[PDB]
Amino acid sequence: STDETPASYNLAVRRAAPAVVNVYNRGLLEIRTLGSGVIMDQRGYIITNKHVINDADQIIVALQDGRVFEALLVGSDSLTDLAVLKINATGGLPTIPINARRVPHIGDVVLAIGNPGQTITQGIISATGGRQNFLQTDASINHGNSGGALVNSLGELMGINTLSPEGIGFAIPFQLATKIMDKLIRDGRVI
Amino acid sequence: STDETPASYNLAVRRAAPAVVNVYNRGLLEIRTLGSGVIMDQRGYIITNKHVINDADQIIVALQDGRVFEALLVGSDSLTDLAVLKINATGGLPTIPINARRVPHIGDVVLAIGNPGQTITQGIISATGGRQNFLQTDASINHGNSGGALVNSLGELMGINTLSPEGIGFAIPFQLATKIMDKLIRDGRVI
Amino acid sequence: STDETPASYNLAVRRAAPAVVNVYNRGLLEIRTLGSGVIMDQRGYIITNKHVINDADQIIVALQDGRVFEALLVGSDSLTDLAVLKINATGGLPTIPINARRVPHIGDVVLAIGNPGQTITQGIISATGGRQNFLQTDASINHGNSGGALVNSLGELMGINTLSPEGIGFAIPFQLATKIMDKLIRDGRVI
């Protein structure tokens, strides 16, 4: 035992977890924990759930490495319950690994990462995903990880954890989430 | 990441999932989803749960590949809550992989496959299984997969998912299910 | 399929499960199942939950191999809900594998072993752990395994399953559990 290495998905945690953040509201002084989010690129864009940021007076985002920014709402999308936020990117933002060539398959191991410290759960893709139906997994998806990332054993993004037929959780496929993000960055709320 | 392959049990899904079917009732016009089932052999026999087919006016079975047959009830077994159905086998029926030599061990990875699209969940054998006590697993077993198959990482049948001490699901060991099926094929309902 | 070997954590079950025991009460004749426990060393010391043994007239411990001892309460610790018991050690007691050099990492596969036959569930370490916060896992932790062991793929002890924010279970890190045990062996109940 002392010699061998335990079976683990910590590799995927190290690669992906730095990019998953905590999202807060700062009403006026009161601070509330809204949910989780995912940093997508170096420009400083972040995906979360529309319900997380629906009634936010001031939106704060907190990385695992200690940094704390204020975020502005780029726009949202009610059908997929997504929302894009924006923050100034100090040189060096951790971003969620994305592989556009990677095709998710049923049975793929996935970790749901969310920051209520950080909390990670394991399952598989039960079913591959408005425009299209969503990705299903038996990894626990709750408020503490709603808006966070779902990743495979390599750390590659498979989807965005979402809330709301029992024992199964839902994520929005990363292909669709990317397209919704882009369209929200250009136009605003899009229909 | 782009180079490497994600950890996955999709191999077992491809081998086993084609054999798991949807079972319906066709009362007179109304169609209801009863549950799931498993095709056992080329003769066209199918195992499901006695409770799934208990009050069926007309029984319909639907494969993943698009084919739709009517099934007749060969007989049932109340103690194990199993039921054997029969359909005409067009040349080429997908059958559930079975390995009679394979000995299931505690800790074995298992997938619960059921067709409510198809839905798959992952766990292990918590406990190895009337005549004998049943197999236990922490893979989610619900109505959407009740009557479906439980399989290992190789796709080999370990048992038949059944419903009805929390957080644990139950399947009937494939050895016992085979024997009950045979006895139901020969005699009818057996005691 | 017939050739290949199923993915399994049965290795860790064989190494660790023999050490996890059933704990009973023997009030005066009535016998009740209190919960689970873990044999730590050859001296015959056993860890369980303070709540399992809180109102015990007579404490009985039963190994998987058939042996049945009476245990005496060495002392307890309310903050961590732990308790140390003692039994006479016939030559040959199975003990829970412990690796003091092993550092638990987030994402590590873990099995929760408890004896309500024996029942085992699988998850990962969601979060690494009074003195310190506890270890989190998505492996099912219930009464049937409360007081039992949490182990990695190698069978090495990671913590003691404990009961009492949804979908997540808690174990006391094995490093802290060792220290509490020692201090309870020397002084008694410790503060």
Side-chain angles (χ1 to χ4, degrees), chain A residues 2 4-27 30-131 133-165 167-188 190-191, chain B residues 2 4-27 30-131 133-165 167-188 190-191, chain C residues 2 4-27 30-131 133-165 167-188 190-191:
Chain A
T2 173
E4 35 195 352
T5 63
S8 182
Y9 298 109
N10 174 264
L11 170 63
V13 168
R14 290 196 315 257
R15 290 183 183 177
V20 188
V21 309
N22 217 315
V23 175
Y24 300 96
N25 168 88
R26 202 194 209 174
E30 57 151 331
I31 286 185
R32 305 151 44 184
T33 169
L34 293 177
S36 310
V38 181
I39 302 172
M40 304 304 296
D41 57 43
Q42 282 297 350
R43 298 185 308 193
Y45 288 106
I46 295 172
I47 296 182
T48 191
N49 281 328
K50 182 191 191 318
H51 69 261
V52 171
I53 62 96
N54 208 63
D55 298 346
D57 315 339
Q58 180 180 18
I59 297 162
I60 292 179
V61 170
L63 285 66
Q64 282 289 112
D65 69 13
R67 292 184 284 173
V68 180
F69 308 83
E70 180 184 40
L72 294 174
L73 184 53
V74 184
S76 73
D77 185 322
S78 305
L79 193 43
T80 46
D81 181 25
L82 289 195
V84 179
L85 303 176
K86 177 65 163 64
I87 54 102
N88 296 23
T90 322
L93 268 183
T95 57
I96 185 75
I98 297 182
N99 184 352
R101 302 304 207 193
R102 182 69 67 196
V103 178
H105 296 124
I106 299 186
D108 280 3
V109 169
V110 290
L111 306 177
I113 309 183
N115 194 355
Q118 221 172 40
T119 279
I120 302 193
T121 66
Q122 178 269 312
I124 61 173
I125 297 174
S126 314
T128 182
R131 296 159 186 163
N133 193 29
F134 311 146
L135 189 148
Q136 294 178 23
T137 175
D138 62 332
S140 312
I141 299 307
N142 44 40
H143 296 286
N145 63 42
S146 199
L150 192 64
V151 293
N152 56 23
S153 83
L154 304 179
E156 302 164 354
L157 181 63
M158 300 281 85
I160 299 293
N161 306 335
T162 189
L163 283 173
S164 305
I168 289 290
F170 287 88
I172 289 141
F174 76 91
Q175 291 296 16
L176 171 61
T178 285
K179 289 167 60 176
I180 294 176
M181 184 185 66
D182 290 350
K183 293 170 178 161
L184 287 185
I185 287 172
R186 176 179 58 177
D187 313 347
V190 167
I191 323 180
Chain B
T2 173
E4 35 195 352
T5 63
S8 182
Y9 298 109
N10 174 264
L11 170 63
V13 168
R14 290 196 315 257
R15 290 183 183 177
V20 188
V21 309
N22 217 315
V23 175
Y24 300 96
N25 168 88
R26 202 194 209 174
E30 57 151 331
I31 286 185
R32 305 151 44 184
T33 169
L34 293 177
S36 310
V38 181
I39 302 172
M40 303 304 296
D41 57 43
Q42 282 297 350
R43 298 185 308 193
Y45 288 106
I46 295 172
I47 296 182
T48 191
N49 281 328
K50 182 191 191 318
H51 69 261
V52 171
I53 62 96
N54 208 63
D55 298 346
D57 315 339
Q58 180 180 18
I59 297 162
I60 292 179
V61 170
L63 285 66
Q64 282 289 112
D65 69 13
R67 292 184 284 173
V68 180
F69 308 83
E70 180 184 40
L72 294 174
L73 184 53
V74 184
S76 73
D77 185 322
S78 305
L79 193 43
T80 46
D81 181 25
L82 289 195
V84 179
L85 303 176
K86 177 65 163 64
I87 54 102
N88 296 23
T90 322
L93 268 183
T95 57
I96 185 75
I98 297 182
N99 184 352
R101 302 304 207 193
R102 182 69 67 196
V103 178
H105 296 124
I106 299 186
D108 280 3
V109 169
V110 290
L111 306 177
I113 309 183
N115 194 355
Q118 221 172 40
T119 279
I120 302 193
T121 66
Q122 178 269 312
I124 61 173
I125 297 174
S126 314
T128 182
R131 296 159 186 163
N133 193 29
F134 311 146
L135 189 148
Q136 294 178 23
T137 175
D138 62 332
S140 312
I141 299 307
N142 44 40
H143 296 286
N145 63 42
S146 199
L150 192 64
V151 293
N152 56 23
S153 83
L154 304 179
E156 302 164 354
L157 181 63
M158 300 281 85
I160 299 293
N161 306 335
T162 189
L163 283 173
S164 305
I168 289 290
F170 287 88
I172 289 141
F174 76 91
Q175 291 296 16
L176 171 61
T178 285
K179 289 167 60 176
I180 294 176
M181 184 185 66
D182 290 350
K183 293 170 178 161
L184 287 185
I185 287 172
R186 176 179 58 177
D187 313 347
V190 167
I191 323 180
Chain C
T2 173
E4 35 195 352
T5 63
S8 182
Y9 298 109
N10 174 264
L11 170 63
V13 168
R14 290 196 315 257
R15 290 183 183 177
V20 188
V21 309
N22 217 315
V23 175
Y24 300 96
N25 168 88
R26 202 194 209 174
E30 57 151 331
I31 286 185
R32 305 151 44 184
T33 169
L34 293 177
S36 310
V38 181
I39 302 172
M40 303 304 296
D41 57 43
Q42 282 297 350
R43 298 185 308 193
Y45 288 106
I46 295 172
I47 296 182
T48 191
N49 281 328
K50 182 191 191 318
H51 69 261
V52 171
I53 62 96
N54 208 63
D55 298 346
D57 315 339
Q58 180 180 18
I59 297 162
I60 292 179
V61 170
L63 285 66
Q64 282 289 112
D65 69 13
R67 292 184 284 173
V68 180
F69 308 83
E70 180 184 40
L72 294 174
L73 184 53
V74 184
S76 73
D77 185 322
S78 305
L79 193 43
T80 46
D81 181 25
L82 289 195
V84 179
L85 303 176
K86 177 65 163 64
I87 54 102
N88 296 23
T90 322
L93 268 183
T95 57
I96 185 75
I98 297 182
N99 184 352
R101 302 304 207 193
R102 182 69 67 196
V103 178
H105 296 124
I106 299 186
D108 280 3
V109 169
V110 290
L111 306 177
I113 309 183
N115 194 355
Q118 221 172 40
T119 279
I120 302 193
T121 66
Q122 178 269 312
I124 61 173
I125 297 174
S126 314
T128 182
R131 296 159 186 163
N133 193 29
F134 311 146
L135 189 148
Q136 294 178 23
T137 175
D138 62 332
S140 312
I141 299 307
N142 44 40
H143 296 286
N145 63 42
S146 199
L150 192 64
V151 293
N152 56 23
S153 83
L154 304 179
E156 302 164 354
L157 181 63
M158 300 281 85
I160 299 293
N161 306 335
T162 189
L163 283 173
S164 305
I168 289 290
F170 287 88
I172 289 141
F174 76 91
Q175 291 296 16
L176 171 61
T178 285
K179 289 167 60 176
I180 294 176
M181 184 185 66
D182 290 350
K183 293 170 178 161
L184 287 185
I185 287 172
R186 176 179 58 177
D187 313 347
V190 167
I191 323 180

